[PDB]
Ligand binder design. Structure first.
Ligand SMILES: Cc1cc2nc3c(=O)[nH]c(=O)nc-3n(C[C@H](O)[C@H](O)[C@H](O)COP(=O)(O)OP(=O)(O)OC[C@H]3O[C@@H](n4cnc5c(N)ncnc54)[C@H](O)[C@@H]3O)c2cc1C
Ligand SMILES: Cc1cc2nc3c(=O)[nH]c(=O)nc-3n(C[C@H](O)[C@H](O)[C@H](O)COP(=O)(O)OP(=O)(O)OC[C@H]3O[C@@H](n4cnc5c(N)ncnc54)[C@H](O)[C@@H]3O)c2cc1C
Lengths: 105, 494, 494, 105
């Protein structure tokens, strides 16, 4: 299942709590078409890849996280390893998403 | 009394049109800037994101709903052009609000991305001076914090004014609430005659709603009155009902709902006569008040006009206090428009950190009222021109026009109106420009630049028009009001 | 030798845009005028009434069909604003033609009535000079008649040019025939790259038709090329198919019809490669020829350019012969636009019978190409500006813009483009203005007046924009092409 | 029935051949809406009054008869008596039309 992190303190709390495990962050906005389109797949992928940590950061709710991470457009998927950005890409491309997970997992 | 070091070169109070523009220009020159932006909730709790009035509850959503109204007319016009559309097409309020807010959100996000891009610090909190070069900032959870800066910029804007009558704050909405209304307004009463009042009444009716406008006295005070009345006249012809010389004294809830039923009790402006009507929604568009009274200006010494709440500044937007500037709607005797706040802010930053001496020019700023039939204007209104130069030195050239796009749908001939105000004394300067028609704003912009260049009737007449375009009507004006000649064009069949 | 008494003071050959304008001004001053207007049929027999090219087979019908195309997009845009519009609405070609012709008829009538009103004599007949101050006129039944006049005005305009290849005149249509086509064109091939070719291809596609454009060399010759390619790029991006470096050599009829089936064989412009395609209609938009070779100019001595067919005139539209003037499209090195012909005619009449000394100004005449994405321009194109002042003295300020109206439908961001050409020499004069976007013509008009006043970048920047309007993009241009900085706008998701 | 007069001679011929009988002329245009809206009633009215002579003149086909009768708008109805104009008005007002016919019979 996906973690609907809802706090700038919670985001860093989530990453630090992850450890060595790859953390997948879905930066989304309910006002972005492609972001809403891919959301269902991001969640179906979290039920497939149990080994990985799935987080969802609504850019409107956590204006902090999203801002701190240098996010430009939605959707934007970031991969953190030991609280360190070790993978990133924008776009609602599910193939590139699932493929990037394996690459880092 | 004063920090050994400022946390910033400039702190901006208010992340609206002027503030955000100001912030980016300053940063552009490596200055350390922080924008404080907070949106205190409307009485019903509505609130929105970064961007300011225009972005969230002003220009943007209003023009979008106006477009929605225009598209309704387009559906009708398209039949005669050969498009097989149904006779009556329903409109969905919630879908519109959704699309409108979604675009607003992209804009909110857009501004947050832009600030960071310029490494400008943004703090979603209410800023308030406490002492020389010092300001307090409170967030959503009540967490205060103090900051110091070499300079400050007040760009707090304004918010909807209420009637101060029983039930207005608990049952009536303002423009602040309309643009994100959770349900279709239904039968609506718009209270006011400002451009906000008319534009809103117009698109609401444009989308099928039962609309009524209660006016205290005249329409669009501040604008050319002949145009204003032509606007009202057009609104009236197109469904919008008007109730003149009346002001609400009390609003009572008949039944809560989404929407509910409200009972409005209004009194005459010239008598004790009282009238009451039943409506689903009651919008108050009666003006806005400057947000300059709860930001600790006293603790810093910046003087403002205590009555109006406006802030007096020099021609460089500097208050009475050397390191404190102000821009946007709150300025006293200026122009309350978004592009204006942006120019002022950008130029301020350039004068302060780029060595520029160019000042914002508040003279002959063009404007456009997006009523059903749009109205663009720049320069002096007619009445205002006679006062300044004398009735005998003012020649008014005018004419009706019929947009080609309207001929096939066969509607509204002799409605669109064009007029320029010329100053005979010397070389017939075009001191005033007024247009009532489609895309009024697209039509007025270039002409505003022309007035900036000192356009004369001779130069105007020497300019060739573009055919077939509405704007060309201005290149061949020959009939004056003084001559009393007709300008009433004939219909299709003559 | 000379008629003891001239039948008229002024006889006008051609009842088009300039002629009719000329006629009314002259009459306005009690002069005896006669307008001769006749429409020789297209090869397929098409013909029309009084008014000229623009009224019958030019500006008017073309902009109306263009609007039809725009309304199709409006139907789509509306769904997103909340109108419960069907996903796919079908268009009816015949209904459109009907409505279009009906409007042209009211115009044809308006002119006959306006001429009779000014006591101007209208004769539906082909004029042909026979001798000094004498002209012959032949009607529909071949009835000739001679008339004499103190002065004559040649305002015959032009007509579509053909390829002079097998089957073009018997199977291909021109703009002269398109606007009243008895049936829907179906799969269409437009041959040419002039504004007529592109505007026509655009609205045809706009209404659902399969469209292809065969081009010999460059698009919109004579116009700023970056804009032209952006136009073509937008047309192609929107379904319009292009075939570059090819010109038809032969057109053949597979099967007659309404529409029928036509085979087009075209060779390459730089090789021997031949390609063939099947289409229902083939329109030739490859230029127009002056109607100055069958009107007996030799019998009166008026010299014209034998190669191009244009008529050389003084800056007052006077030919080499003292009592014979010429205006409109047939003039040499002028501006072939309707408003131009009208100005010239009106002023000519005023100089001749009102004692005016004002000449028509053919400098910096604005224009608008009504392609899917409209293009308005005034002044020098970019390439033309470098040639005149030097590459190093030209600063080009530009920017993309996204019409607010397009945000909710969420389409075409970073398409509309704006640019001005500035002359660094002394004051950064705005010598060129170019816009690609909605209502380009409404946007360009005022700015044309501004260029007339000598608008400079400084004055432009000092002008405040109208928000939220497309045209405002011109008041805040800061990014030059020389800097190479980027000008893309944020999308729906940023 | 209505007689579509197509000539200035056919017109003078209709005016003379009518004798003392009232003749109503409908000045029309195929492109004029009001003209089209009234056409039916005019034609149907012709059948209702067999005591009257109904003529229809198309301003585009008979351009001279229209300018000679000095017509500036459609619908325009002109009434004649013994070849002289006794009635006239512009507009697609059927009540007025039928009423004018009744006042001139
Ligand atoms: C319904 C409506 C329609 C309009 N339509 C148009 C139009 O079509 N065209 C046009 O040109 N103008 C229009 N306007 C006006 C335009 O929106 C304003 O002129 C413009 O927003 C003013 O800019 P500003 O920077 O002065 O203030 P604003 O944009 O109002 O921004 C002020 C910001 O500062 C914040 N703030 C206030 N106090 C504090 C504080 N103490 N600490 C921190 N933040 C604070 C506010 O909450 C807000 O975010 C419209 C207005 C309304 C209400
Ligand atoms: C498809 C198309 C689209 C266009 N769109 C635009 C537009 O959007 N904006 C714009 O400004 N311009 C536009 N134009 C151009 C515009 O129509 C011309 O610039 C304008 O019509 C020129 O006016 P004129 O008086 O020179 O001639 P015309 O209007 O062409 O009139 C000449 C008239 O004289 C008649 N004639 C010719 N020979 C004789 C003779 N020997 N005796 C008697 N009568 C004669 C002709 O049949 C005609 O009625 C367009 C043109 C075309 C073909």
């Amino acid at each position: 299942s996906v973690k609907q992190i809802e706090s700038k303190t919670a985001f860093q709390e989530a990453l630090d709590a992850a450890g060595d495990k790859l953390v997948v962050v879905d930066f989304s906005a309910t006002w972005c078409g492609p972001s809403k389109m891919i959301k269902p797949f991001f969640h179906s992928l979290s039920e497939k890849y149990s080994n990985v940590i799935f987080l969802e950061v609504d850019v409107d709710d956590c204006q902090d996280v999203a801002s701190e991470c240098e996010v430009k457009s939605m959707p934007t998927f970031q991969f953190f390893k030991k609280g360190q950005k070790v993978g990133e890409f924008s776009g609602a491309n599910k193939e590139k998403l699932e493929a990037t997970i394996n690459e880092l997992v | 009394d004063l920090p050994k070091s400022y946390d910033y070169d400039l702190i901006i109070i208010g992340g609206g049109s002027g503030g955000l523009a100001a912030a980016k220009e300053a940063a552009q020159y490596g200055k350390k800037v922080m924008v404080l932006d907070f949106v205190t909730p409307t009485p019903l709790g509505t609130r929105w994101g970064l961007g300011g009035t225009c972005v969230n509850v002003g220009c943007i959503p209003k023009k979008l709903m106006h477009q929605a109204a225009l598209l309704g007319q387009a559906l009708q016009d398209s039949r005669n052009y050969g498009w097989k559309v149904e006779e009556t097409v329903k409109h969905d309020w919630d879908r519109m609000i959704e699309a409108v807010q979604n675009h607003i959100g992209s804009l909110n996000w857009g501004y947050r991305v832009a600030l960071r891009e310029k490494k400008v610090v943004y703090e979603n909190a209410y800023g308030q001076f406490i002492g020389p070069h010092r300001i307090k900032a409170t967030n959503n959870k009540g967490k205060e914090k103090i900051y110091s800066a070499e300079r400050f910029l007040i760009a707090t804007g304004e918010r909807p004014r209420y009637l101060g009558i029983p039930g207005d704050k608990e049952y009536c909405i303002s423009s602040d609430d309309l643009f994100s209304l959770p349900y279709c307004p239904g039968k609506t009463l718009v209270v006011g005659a400002s451009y906000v009042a008319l534009e809103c009444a117009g698109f609401l009716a444009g989308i099928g709603l039962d609309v009524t406008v209660m006016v205290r006295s005249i329409l669009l005070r501040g604008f050319d009155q002949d145009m204003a009345n032509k606007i009202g006249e057009h609104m009236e012809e197109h469904g919008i009902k008007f109730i003149r010389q009346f002001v609400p004294i009390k609003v009572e809830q008949i039944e809560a709902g989404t929407p509910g039923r409200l009972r409005v009790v209004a009194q005459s402006t010239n008598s004790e006569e009282i009238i009451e009507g039943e409506y689903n929604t009651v919008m108050l568009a009666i003006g806005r008040d400057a947000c300059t009274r709860k930001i600790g200006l006293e603790t810093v010494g910046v003087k403002i006009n205590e009555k109006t709440g406006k802030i007096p500044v020099t021609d460089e937007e500097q208050t009475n206090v050397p390191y404190i500037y102000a821009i946007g709607d709150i300025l006293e005797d200026k122009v309350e428009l978004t592009p204006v706040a942006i120019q002022a802010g950008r130029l301020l930053a350039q004068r302060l950190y780029a060595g520029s001496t160019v000042k914002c020019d508040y003279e002959n700023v063009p404007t456009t009222v997006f009523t059903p039939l749009e109205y663009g204007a720049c320069g002096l209104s007619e009445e205002k021109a006679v006062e300044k130069f004398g009735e005998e030195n003012i020649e008014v050239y005018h004419s009706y026009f019929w947009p080609l796009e309207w001929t096939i749908p066969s509607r509204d001939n002799n409605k669109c109106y064009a007029k320029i105000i010329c100053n005979t004394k010397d070389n017939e300067r075009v001191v005033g420009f007024h247009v009532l028609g489609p895309n009024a704003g697209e039509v007025t912009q270039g002409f505003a630049a022309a007035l900036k260049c000192g356009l004369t009737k001779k130069q105007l007449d020497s300019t060739i028009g573009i055919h077939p375009v509405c704007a060309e009507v201005f290149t061949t004006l020959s009939v004056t009001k003084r001559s009393g000649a007709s300008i009433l064009q004939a219909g299709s069949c003559g």
